[PDB]
RNA sequence: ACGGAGGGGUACCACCAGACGUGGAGUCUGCGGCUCAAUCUGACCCAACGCGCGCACCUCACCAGGCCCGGACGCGCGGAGGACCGACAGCCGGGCGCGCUUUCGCGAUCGCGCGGGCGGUGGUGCAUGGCCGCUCCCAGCCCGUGGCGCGAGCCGUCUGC
RNA sequence: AGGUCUGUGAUGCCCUCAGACGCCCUGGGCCGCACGCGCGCUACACUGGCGGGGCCAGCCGGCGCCCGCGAGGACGCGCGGAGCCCCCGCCGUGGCCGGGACCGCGGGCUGGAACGCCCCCGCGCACCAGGAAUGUCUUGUAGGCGCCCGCCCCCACCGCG
């Protein structure tokens, strides 16, 4: 039973053609995927 | 002077070989049912496998064209992992079937799942088989024939062996199971060929004039 | 030309090997010469109990697999390459009775 | 856990690179080639079996058979083994 | 349970070229040694016993093929509705026939 | 069928003549009882008790604990403006993205409800098949024509050697 | 109404079926012990035990060199068979050098993992031919002596020979 959230806009990481995000892919950085 | 590691190879080869012989009667046992599979065996030339397969009537298995055969032929060659073409095949016809056991029980399988009582299959079996030239034939269903309570009423016509190194060669014996509403109907069939090929059966004397 | 061929042949039933062996005989004569050697019997054993359960007296199974074994190395350099074909294919074809060559 | 280490002396006590030797039994080449899966069947065993009806109680290994006892008077004729003496 | 497209297709194609697939009968993990499929890995890869299985499951469910069970094998043959199926899956045009049909003798 | 009825035969799973043993001790193994969370179960005169082919894991069923769905196939609804599925840090935990404080991913290979499957060393061997055991280390069992009896039955198939 | 639904893609009718009796993992147990009995093994000694030497089998069958008291181990190649018995000595009727259970230090093998199996020094249990009762056996037989296969990662007082 994770306790996920929802969200419908997963597209505003950006402003307008941003690189926001650390091809494309506190405690610092944890990348999608392997670590 | 000779090295008995070796030859267990040619000893192996054999023995393997007998193996995939019998998953081979089981599979068609199972599959050519209605086209009067008997037996099997088996060539294991190198180049290429050879079958050949005792069948009432071959144009059945043989398929328009020859298509059930060569459907037949790719499959194996996967299971046992030969290159395909080089497992042919070939189909030979059952003359006498009223002297080959298994095609009576079968039929008398088919007979019995379109419900008609026993008492007329397993006389018709047996006449059949006279007519065929044999001097016996025993056959026996065991099972919950009636309500409950299950017993075996067996029916026979003429005189059979039941003993002996000569019931390996003259008496030829079958059985299958019979699945049902009630539960399970046992069936098996024996016949007596004494004239059968060219041997001669002991303790019988010919004299002259 | 000379390859000291080989003929092994394996069966489990005695009537059908010494009928080869004939046939193979008669066909050799001229392809140099064929005499056999008949080999122990390797005879499998495998004991097995009579029941499915484990009741009553203890009553036992006997089977056996006896395989036998003969061997015409006498070709030699008696046959050649194609040489050893024709015999092997004038021979009859029974269906059971492995065969392997080697020089 | 990939970000996950040890001790310098934790770690030429482990275990040298060996294959287990525990193999299964392959009876034919064409049965392998080789979440949950970190450990749905990791330990690693024999698992021969009969050739016929799959059990692994009574199995003669004798010859390089693979058959039950019981899954075995039935097609030993078929085979080739005969009862005399 | 999430199978890739390359192993239906390779699957199929195993099927149409050979009419059949005698499969074990196995639920570890392991790799089957005959088909085989190509998805940049390595030179080929070859799948999964489970996803294999899965799919056999299903085609025979849908009528596609017709097992006949024996010394614990698997023993799959497409009939007629399964050839009128997988002749699209592949893009396969009319016509065309599986290589058994080719005159092996 | 039985007879502490008679008459003929037979066999070291019967005796005579003899031989070698067991029941005596220590120990291996199996069987009932006690104990335990569990000490998994079948078989009980011959015709159960090293027998159901060697139990540290598997085998394995029983005890204390945890992952997974591998829910086929049909109808209704929903869904890419996102169905379902994986993961770093840091704990809780035997352990594992099992769960937890968070946010990255993957992409219809489907989700839910209703029918319907698959599977199960789960019960009944007093519902069954098949295979064994015993009756039986036996010598006995039957058909056609005919004859005797209302008939069940008898003769054939023998009170001799 | 003998045994087997726990050998099987042999099965009728029941029961279980998303906190599962399905499948997979970690541990424990099937071996625990005041007690009754079934098949076996080892002995109770001089028609013997210990030490040294000589020598012959069959189902069938694999060996060298070097370390280590040994069990075992590192390398490298295809080649190959025993107990009783016989000969010479010691012991000298003493629960003694008969017997080898139990326990205390130590060295190795299998395996992912010893609770398992081998070897060395020391300690040295019952047992003096066995009550009422009972089993098997007629020639290469009984008995005595050992050797191979099966199941098996390791292990035979068992079983087939």
Redesign the pocket.
Known sequence: ?????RL?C?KY?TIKGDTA?PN??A?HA?????? | ?????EENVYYSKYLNDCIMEAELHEFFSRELVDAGYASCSLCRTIDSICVIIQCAEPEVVMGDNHYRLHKIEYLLAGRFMCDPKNFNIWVDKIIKRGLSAEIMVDNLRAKLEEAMPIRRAAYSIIRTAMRAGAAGCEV?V???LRA???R?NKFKEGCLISTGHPKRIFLAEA?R?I?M????????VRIYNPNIRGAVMPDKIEIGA | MHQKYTIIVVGKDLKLVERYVKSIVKEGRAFGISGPCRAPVR?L?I??????????????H?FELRMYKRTFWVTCGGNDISTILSKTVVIPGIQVTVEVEEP | ????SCGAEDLDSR?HPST???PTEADNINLASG??E??????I????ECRI??????????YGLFI????F??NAGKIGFVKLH | ???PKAVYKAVYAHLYENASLALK?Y?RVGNVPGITYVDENGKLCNPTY?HVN?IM??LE??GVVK?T??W?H?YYLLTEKGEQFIRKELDLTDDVLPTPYSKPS
């Open positions: 039973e994770p306790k996920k959230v419908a997963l990481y995000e494309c892919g405690r944890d990348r999608c995927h392997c670590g | 002077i000779v090295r008995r590691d026996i065991a099972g919950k409950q309570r299950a075996a059985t199971h699945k509403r009630q539960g399970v109907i046992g069936v098996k | 005879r054993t004991t097995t109990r009579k029941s499915p359960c484990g009741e009553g007296t203890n009553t036992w006997r | 856990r990939n970000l996950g275990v287990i030797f525990w979440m949950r970190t450990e749905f069947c990791t330990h065993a024999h698992k021969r009806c799959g059990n692994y109680n009574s199995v003669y290994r004798k039950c006892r019981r899954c008077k039935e | 349970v999430h199978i009968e639920w489970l899965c499951q299903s469910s849908r097992d069970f024996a614990r698997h």
